[model samples]
Target: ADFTQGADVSGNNVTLWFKSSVNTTWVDVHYKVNSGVQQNVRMSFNAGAARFEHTILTAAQAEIEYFFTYNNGPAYDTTTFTYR
Candidate 1:
């Protein structure tokens, strides 16, 4: 298994970042803002940075989740961000 997680928040958008052990093709971001419904988005792997940007409210809390699948198969658990 691999382990890495990070993000950058700007204005009403947050760019989520992570790391993978193998060459990744896509990173699917499942997220929800405040009490809204969940939305799915895909981000491509760039260098060692797999990033996804999500737009939230002017002032709101959100939860972003992601995982990568490689030759070893998909990750058993997902990584989440709630602004520790």
Candidate 2:
């Protein structure tokens, strides 16, 4: 995607972007707050930018860890977010 691969935390939501350099069919993000139960969110493809992206809303601040799965593949990469 045109946007960088990272998160934008503002208000009560965070926007995440995953730009696949190679061609991909699907993308999913497995994420969790602190050490809570994990959750998944599908990254909708953007045709023009050709990026997989999603947004999450969390009321309270906490450590967010996540990873990306390409085309239903395994969790190949991971990252964590911390913000005020």
Q: lDDT (0-100) at residue 28 of candidate 2?
A: 77
Number of clashing residue pairs in every model? 0, 0
What is candidate 1's lDDT per residue for 1-84, written digit by digit as tens? Answer: 564656667775666655656444445666655546766666555554443333444532455444333223443436455542
- Candidate 2: segments with Cα more than 4 A from true spot: 1-4, 47-49, 72-84
Candidate 1 collision pairs: none
Task: Determine the backbone clash count of candidate 1.
Answer: 0
Candidate 2: lDDT of 36?
A: 79
**What lDDT does the true structure give each of the candidates?**
0.51, 0.65
TM-scores for the candidates: 0.57, 0.67
In model 1, what is the error at residue 18, expressed in angstroms?
A: 1.9
